[PDB]
Amino acid sequence: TLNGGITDMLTELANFEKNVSQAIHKYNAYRKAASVIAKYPHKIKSGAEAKKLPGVGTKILEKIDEFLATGKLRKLEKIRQDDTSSSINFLTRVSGIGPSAARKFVDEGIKTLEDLRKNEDKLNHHQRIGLKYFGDFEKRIPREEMLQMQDIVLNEVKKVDSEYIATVCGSFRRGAESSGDMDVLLTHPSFTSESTKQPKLLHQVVEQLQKVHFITDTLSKGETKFMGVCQLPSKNDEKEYPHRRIDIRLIPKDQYYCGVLYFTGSDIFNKNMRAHALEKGFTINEYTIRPLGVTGVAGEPLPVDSEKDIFDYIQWKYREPKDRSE
DNA sequence: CCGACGTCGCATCAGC
DNA sequence: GCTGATGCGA
DNA sequence: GTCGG
Ligand SMILES: Nc1ccn([C@H]2C[C@H](O)[C@@H](COP(=O)(O)OP(=O)(O)OP(=O)(O)O)O2)c(=O)n1
Ligand SMILES: Nc1ccn([C@H]2C[C@H](O)[C@@H](COP(=O)(O)O)O2)c(=O)n1
Ligand SMILES: [Cl-]
Ligand SMILES: [Cl-]
Ligand SMILES: [Mg+2]
Ligand SMILES: [Mg+2]
Numbered sequence: 070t071l072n073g074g075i076t077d078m079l080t081e082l083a084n085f086e087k088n089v090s091q092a093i094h095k096y097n098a099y100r101k102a103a104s105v106i107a108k109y110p111h112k113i114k115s116g117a118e119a120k121k122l123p124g125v126g127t128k129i130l131e132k133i134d135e136f137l138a139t140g141k142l143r144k145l146e147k148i149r150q151d152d153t154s155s156s157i158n159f160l161t162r163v164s165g166i167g168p169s170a171a172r173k174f175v176d177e178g179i180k181t182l183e184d185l186r187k188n189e190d191k192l193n194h195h196q197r198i199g200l201k202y203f204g205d206f207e208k209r210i211p212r213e214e215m216l217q218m219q220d221i222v223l224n225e226v227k228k229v230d231s232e233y234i235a236t237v238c239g240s241f242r243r244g245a246e247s248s249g250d251m252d253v254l255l256t257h258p259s260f261t262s263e264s265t266k267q268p269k270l271l272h273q274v275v276e277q278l279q280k281v282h283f284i285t286d287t288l289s290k291g292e293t294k295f296m297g298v299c300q301l302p303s304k305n306d307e308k309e310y311p312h313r314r315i316d317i318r319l320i321p322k323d324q325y326y327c328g329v330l331y332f333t334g335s336d337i338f339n340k341n342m343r344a345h346a347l348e349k350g351f352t353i354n355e356y357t358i359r360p361l362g363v364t365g366v367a368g369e370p371l372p373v374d375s376e377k378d379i380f381d382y383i384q385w386k387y388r389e390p391k392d393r394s395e
Numbered sequence: 396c397c398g399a400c401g402t403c404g405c406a407t408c409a410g411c
Numbered sequence: 412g413c414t415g416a417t418g419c420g421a
Numbered sequence: 422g423t424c425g426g
């Protein structure tokens with residue numbers, strides 16, 4: 070990519086601020102700047118050129134000038150040398166280990182993959198599965214495998230109840246040639262914003278996917294959100310496929326458009342779009358778009374009959390999913 | 396300057 | 412048990 | 422760390 074050196078540097082700084090500094094707004098700020106630079110269609114020649122972009126300020130402009138001149142950032146070169154920062158950054162790569170647990174583990178002398186495997190009984194369930202599949206979860210999924218997985222989930226969901234609709238969202242719906250995981254939005258006419266006429270709607274689907282050995286593990290599970298692990302079947306004498314992360318979100322059927330907007334993302338796109346809604350006097354979540362009175366209090370949900378209706382309310386031209394990869 | 400920064404589901408814990 | 416943070420995640 | 426009133 071045109072400015073990959075810069076965007077990698079800013080991403081590394083973002084991860085430092087999240088995992089080590091525990092400064093979520095600096096993390097979001099660095100990621101917003103990396104994102105706007107990533108889509109900028111010129112090779113950046115100076116910090117001042119970058120500072121014209123929204124989300125790039127004085128400090129990041131100075132880092133860009135240092136990086137352009139020397140190929141590196143002294144602030145990062147030092148962070149890379151700090152053992153405590155290095156340990157925390159590694160531990161947070163395990164699903165279920167966040168910044169707080171990573172610093173506590175380091176305090177307790179658990180700092181390496183070997184240390185984690187020796188101390189399984191100090192991990193909660195989520196973290197224990199994250200460790201089991203540590204290597205697998207850092208591999209990406211070719212779109213060809215995403216298509217095979219789509220076929221399994223959609224056909225198995227149909228076998229439970231033909232009135233279910235499952236929609237693969239996330240980076241897949243944005244047309245990516247590879248995905249970090251699989252994200253599945255689920256609806257059923259029994260579950261609306263007005264009533265739940267049938268229990269176990271998510272459970273029935275998860276159970277079926279476990280029974281055909283597609284879902285292999287569970288990280289967390291409630292009435293509307295499943296977070297877990299899945300795996301494609303391999304043929305005779307084939308090496309097994311990597312285990313993959315899968316998220317399933319059951320959304321009230323009448324709120325599908327807000328749900329699919331949320332679950333298509335990207336995460337940075339949603340933050341930018343929701344922030345723009347706020348400036349326009351609206352609030353968006355995965356269920357509704359609601360006005361804000363002078364109150365600052367959300368009003369009643371507005372009618373939504375398409376994804377584009379949501380963009381229209383906030384005076385944005387419609388963006389196809391493939392153009393939301395921020 | 397300085398308050399705001401997207402929004403919410405599930406797991407875990409503390410305090411009653 | 413319930414409720415309200417807090418952590419971690421989408 | 423950046424933005425906007
Ligand atoms: N902090 C976050 C994280 C995620 N999401 C949303 C939008 C995402 O696109 C979606 C799925 O989360 P993923 O982490 O799976 O992100 P992607 O599917 O977009 O990318 P990847 O290829 O890494 O899975 O849920 C969000 O709104 N806010
Ligand atoms: N998971 C899904 C996907 C689509 N739908 C509905 C919402 C729309 O009325 C209709 C249009 O589908 P599509 O967006 O795939 O064109 O399908 C649903 O209820 N649940
Ligand atoms: Cl909707
Ligand atoms: Cl709502
Ligand atoms: Mg995904
Ligand atoms: Mg603002």
Ligand code: NA
Nearest residue numbers: 120121122125
């Ligand atoms: Na700027």
Ligand code: NA
Nearest residue numbers: 161163164166
């Ligand atoms: Na983690």
Ligand code: NA
Nearest residue numbers: 250251252316
């Ligand atoms: Na996901």
